[model samples]
Target: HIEGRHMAPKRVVQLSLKMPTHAVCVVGVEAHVDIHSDVPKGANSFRVSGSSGVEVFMVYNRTRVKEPIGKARWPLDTDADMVVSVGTASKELKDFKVRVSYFGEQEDQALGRSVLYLTGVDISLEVDTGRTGKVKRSQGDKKTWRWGPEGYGAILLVNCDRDNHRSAEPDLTHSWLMSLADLQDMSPMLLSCNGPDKLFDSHKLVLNVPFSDSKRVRVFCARGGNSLSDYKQVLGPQCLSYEVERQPGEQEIKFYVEGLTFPDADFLGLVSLSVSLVDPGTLPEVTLFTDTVGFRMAPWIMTPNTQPPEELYVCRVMDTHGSNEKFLEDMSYLTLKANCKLTICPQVENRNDRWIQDEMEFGYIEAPHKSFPVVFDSPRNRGLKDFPYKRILGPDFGYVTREIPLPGPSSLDSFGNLDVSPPVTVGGTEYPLGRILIGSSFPKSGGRQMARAVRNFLKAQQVQAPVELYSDWLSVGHVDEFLTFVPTSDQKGFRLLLASPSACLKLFQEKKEEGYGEAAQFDGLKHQAKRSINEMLADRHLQRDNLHAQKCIDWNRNVLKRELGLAESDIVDIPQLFFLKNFYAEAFFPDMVNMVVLGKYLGIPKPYGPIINGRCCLEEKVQSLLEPLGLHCIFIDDYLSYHELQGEIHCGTNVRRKPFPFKWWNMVP
Candidate 1:
């Protein structure tokens, strides 16, 4: 007879059935199993009969077993053992009762059944470990000892036989021993500590310490390490520290402590100190330590470590041949003067590289698509052959790029000319805000789709807030031609720099009144401004296009304040004049707002001439405004270059700035 108990609920349990004697031929085995709990519907039986000669009979609830498990034979043929498996389909603890019976015949006579009762089968699903062992000794015990898991024991001992020269005073000896314990607790492992051994004296300490990752250990003295009270008074407390060099090997580890020198007449005998081994895992805890030792200060020369600050600056390089070589040269000079790292992007081998800022996409080193997407032109419109190249920099840099989609095929467009500002807090979350600053016709010409695409991309990058501004008056359809953001140390975050046509007209009017008499020239400039307006107007093109330069200025300024929530005081005006070309053509003076900011330095376009007989040159006015903000301005001459091409300093160059530390999760709502 066989019986079992404590079968785990909902877990597999193996049952073995062995013949009491080989002479007993096991024909079949029948087991009556009962589940004490409610078995969920669709659940399989808890008992499974083995494939061996044994046959199993199971009962669920009060039902009888209709079909026996496996095949049943009349006479048992094999002497091998039989096995059965069982489990509970119930979710909670369960009780099971199984009555097993074995039947066989020895000489054609019906053998009586041998029965087994398996009752009180309590099931537990929880793991149980009886008890935990206790430690042999406390950590605070201080007799020289070793402790830890196998292969990890730490040792503690005192160095008493090393040329002993100490007084018989207990306090001094005790102090030295205590100091050793403190030192051991404080000296954590070093980066290069797991290497060959090296020694360091006071003089060599300055040279031995590596430029980075060197360790400094502080040593305190209670009663100054000097004998004379007056010497102690003059020098104050003689709490000295050491720069230790550690060289570790497979067999042993060594440490070198820089020595200190005392005045010859004031040399003091050793005091009490303690030595200990610091365990970084336990932090301020020491793994092991020795008794206090009596020590003395030895005289030695000491030196200090002096290193210069690192060279840190954003880098900008021109590799293509889009701008005039002379212009590029002049710009390179200005960049160098500002202490910016510059690299000239080399032209492609056997290909003429005419790609410039508008033709290239620039982004922060971490932007998702390194290259900007190509815009599709409408089916009825023609497309251009050239596409913008994607340029990426390291994390310490920033770039600008945009996308414009038309229809079938489209020409390359200047998307980066759009305005982008540093992260701003809107509704208590940081967002990289941007503005389209274009006209209403944009929506009719696939501008809306492009804007949505760009906005989605920015959101994916965690820039939750993005906005667009409308201004169809400009021919270039770019914000860089007139606006930019300059960081300020003030609480307002950053100030907006705008190209003020009104200020330019005011300067022109002043010039005319000062007998520089250029009334006809001034009138022509006004006419050019009006013509530029007509270019963007459809229905009221002739009437509204007659508006003056001041109106144009007000339109943009109002949008910035009302749409962007910028205050009037936050806007800095740059005097820029409008001019009429030969017939209906128009142009603007060099724009100062189109400048590159490279870490505390500003690269601006040099003014073509005096704003008004040298009273207010663009460079001088810019310097006056930026200098107080701690920004150094560098002017590059762009007379027949970028200015004529409708771009300026920034459009000609790209800046890669160092990225600031940020926690995206913390900033998000």
Candidate 2:
């Protein structure tokens, strides 16, 4: 069967345009090469890619820099298409050519020759687009990242916790890792490099961040093969980009991304992380493939009083008018009974500013890793302006503040005006983190409103869309004055508590019909006249003022029902009456709806309603509505200190509570 019986005839080796990627490299033992099998001939002569540290030599014999084509060839071509594999890639990237020469022959005479050109390697990058628990490979598109139900991207958390108890600062302030626990507060990024191992040995994999993003995020990578303790802060405010190693067998390099700041006017809360396959041997080296992923920093979120309380804060102020020592003692007892920690600010620290609730609000930020409480100091900078930054921002605690754009701020700037509903769904839209409530004037009513900067910050959080209600008709202009929320056991697991002027008047009328019209309000106060029920009811001015207040409450009630998706049964109207002063309303006695709720117990202002048969009918009315829902109402007497000052129990105290059990990421605003 041998062609010509003595010499097997062979055809010319005509190389086609089909070839391996022209130059990205390796020169290892040929694994397999059916690549150019049609022109089944081997090697004659060859040249390697232009990159340095790369060499193409025969496999079996490692003798010379350039071995004979036939000496180390395989059979796909001739001496076996001299099988070839990637060699070490270069330190600088430049298009290079790989030409493999081959010849055809029959017996003795030489035939035409062919040359094959090859260059580059196939590479791809990916991330956890599906939020599917891991970073799986995706399309080679290395850029676009968005946010929404169908958006693909990653997330980052502000490492604002003191993982090392021995350290004075939170992890976010420094680039160094204080402890292994700090890693929990960072999001993970995967740098997947897939190609010939030798190609990466010479070429490099580098990590990068936008120069502006350097101020908001930090990237860390482990150094040793298996120890997390060896992580180095490779990219941060001080470090812009970094070069990394590509271990021979490790296909995935894990990097940790940590947030350093909250979203603000200058920073939109979104940051990016990108990596490039590079060649650092040039004056201004460039990249081959730059892969990127975007992350939204977890927002600083606020919690409502309805959530379980962790700590209760109050301030003591003794003045020429009087002291609230008795009220505070009663408050301390309430916290102890509720099993919550009590923090009482002394007069020296508070500087006679006992309005703790007005000074700040409590909230937290979370990642899948860790969560911590953050106090938001209000722009209503009174004596307590510096209290939060001085006392709260330390160790694991965090502090943030938003100031009014103008120094001449109004009472609406106080955080006491800020409130949030329990998780609610209006119509069909769900707000899992609850809706932020801010008080403003009724449209066309011409009144004070919460500052634009403060409102913008709250709305920009995206998780809690805000709702506005009319409160400018009141002296204090705070939502806390007319509405609050209490946790429940059934239905939505919470109920809205709104002050109702009509409910209070109805109770007074029923008492009058029952022959108790002679009963007097403020029965215990000797300095003030105890107005009789009939006298108060007969006053036309008080009746008209209350009517206006009732109309306002009804307006808000309708809005709350519609915006919060509520039924009549989901609301509890507390017996409350408002009296007009110069035109703006103030609580007639003390607003019962403005109360401090700690789980099953509530510390409400002692609304001094007419004493009917030795009992304050107002207290009985509020308890009658809330007690059946597992709440224990404790009416704290704040008439001299809080009520006289135009604020009630809630305005005088603030509570820090746990975050929501439902994470914010899974829900829409």
Candidate 3:
């Protein structure tokens, strides 16, 4: 019916609905409408090719409306994997609703469609906020940094508050953590805290990054809590004072820094650095709470943070007496602590009988004379002929005397008036050469002078053999300088008895030697054997001449019982000398040549022969003790050359007992 286009002003009526989810609009355009002429409008229809059945329609202003111009089929060439949109023309006021099923009978068809579209333009709509990455600005004035990967930790927070107030509040203290990543993309964890309550707490920040990992982490606390300006702005409640004392290799210093604080990071990510001293010479280095990034702009401020210094401890270690070894034992390395003092002194005491006897006997000397005052010398009583001649040589040399009362009830009386007999020849006699004595004292001026004299005398004696002199004593108080003196000399070797640092130094310089002349030559086995006999006889354990049917019988019986497991009744009344000779054969007969020289030089007493013979009686006893150890005890004589030994006996051969082989004296062995 509409073969030709209507030559008229054509208008179409249409209706559209705004849906709750989406709104759409549609418009119809008449096909070939007249340009100007007004004519009767008619239902314009076309062959809606491939069009779907229309269900309903709505009306619109005829003057403004136009008819559906053409028809087309729904898109079949849709990208099923993509959402597709389509254009539509309608004249209905209500919505053309269509159901959508993602997975259903229409699943293939829906999946095949890609484009999607909304038909109507709505009058009422709201604004969208855009994507999720967009940052939201708050109404109130505030600042924040999305710090960590997920914004979990913080490196710095400068000018922050305590009660969630403004960020720059004063006296504010807080704690925070941060993460650091370098060029390698390796990250380290860091933390920091501030305030008075946080000082002593061992709040350690652990760096979980494995050491073998890609990077290294370093933490430093050059500044305490808070910013440098904050540190300068706030005055501490109390000021601190410290004392510094310098000595030897190290110095003991102490001080404190007040108004110091740990600071947060600035825009450049710097922090603060500060430190304090806790003990003398011990400065516990300052440390950062954690090592992390954002703290790259650390700053240090200098100020009048000085405090009064005080000395808390003093120590002195030295060798005042005894041998150098002894002094070193006293003055070995030591540690000094606060409020502590150390004093080192010699261990010599006047109460020792040996020391007292030696001191008294040599107080005023004679031949082989030796004395030690602040400054002592030999022959203290020399050239004083008025002193009795009997005093110089004892009564055993032919002079005789009774116990004469001295003016002072003095022990010196023994020396003052003594008896002397003609030189009895139990052994060949020897002339007196000289005397030597050793002593130690604190380094008083007088004592030092005495030590010098003694050292000089020893030097002199090295050249003049048989001259009397005291060996070097340990020097106290001056260990650093004391060790310089060489005890062994270019000309002659000298004796040394050290008891202090100086003495140890000298001893070390001399290369410590053990033997002291003839004393060194003394045979311990000989002395033990001879001395035991004297002691046993003094106790009535042996008969003097018969050496049998007496205490010796009892001794032999005991020895036999103990060594051979023989009962007392099994013992026989053998002559004591027979036992003595047998023991002597075991101990010295095979080694008699060695003992002859050692014994003569050492003045080992006469009873040594018989006592050595008796020792075999205890052989089984000794074997029982030593056999299990895979070792056997041998009694051998000891000897050393004169230069190899340095002792008191070397100063004088005159003081020793006579040499062997004249006649038996039956003396105190």
What local distance difference test score does each model get? 0.35, 0.73, 0.20
Error of 2 at 603 (Å): 0.8
Per TM-score, what order, best first?
A: 2, 1, 3
Model 3 deviation from native, Cα RMSD in Å: 38.2
lDDT winner between 1 and 3, please give it.
Answer: 1
For each candidate in turn, the TM-score is 0.43, 0.78, 0.13
Identify the leading candidate in terms of TM-score: 2
lDDT of 3 by residue, 1-669 (tens): 878974533222221112122222212211121111211122121111211222222123343432232333223222211111113432232233322212223323222211112232111101111112222222121222232123311122111112222222221222221111110111111122111112212222122222221011222111234332211211121212112122222211111111112221112222222222121222453222122222221111110001011111111211223223321222122112111222222223211111111121121111101111111112222222211221222211111112212232221111111111111122233211212222222224223223232234333322111111111121111111111011122112211111121221222223223231112112234433232323333333222222331232243234323332333232212111211332211111111111111110111111122212234322233234323333223332111211012111111011112211211111111
Model 3, CA-based lDDT: 0.20
Candidate 1, position 529, lDDT: 32
The segments of candidate 2 whose C-alpha lies over 4 angstroms from its true place after superposition are 1-22, 25-152, 161-171, 175-181, 193-202, 222-232, 245-253, 264-268, 280-286, 444-450
Top candidate, metric lDDT? 2
Worst 10 residues of 1 by lDDT: 300-309
Worst 10 residues of 3 by lDDT: 302-311
Expressed as tens digits, the lDDT of each residue in 1-669 for candidate 1 is 559786422211222233211111101212222222222222322333232223344333343434444434422322222232333221112122232233433223222222222211111111001111211222232322111121111111111111112332211122232223223221111111111122111111111212111211122222332232211110111333223232223212222121121112222212222332232334354322122222122111110000011121122322334446665566566666656656555444203322244443333221111111111111112111232212221122212223445442221134434345554544443343332232222224533323444334433332323345443345554556667776667745667777775665545445555765332321222233322221222223322322343355576678667555567777888766544333221245567777766555667777543334543344666778778776777776654546656667776664434332332212332
Model 1: lDDT of residue 524: 21
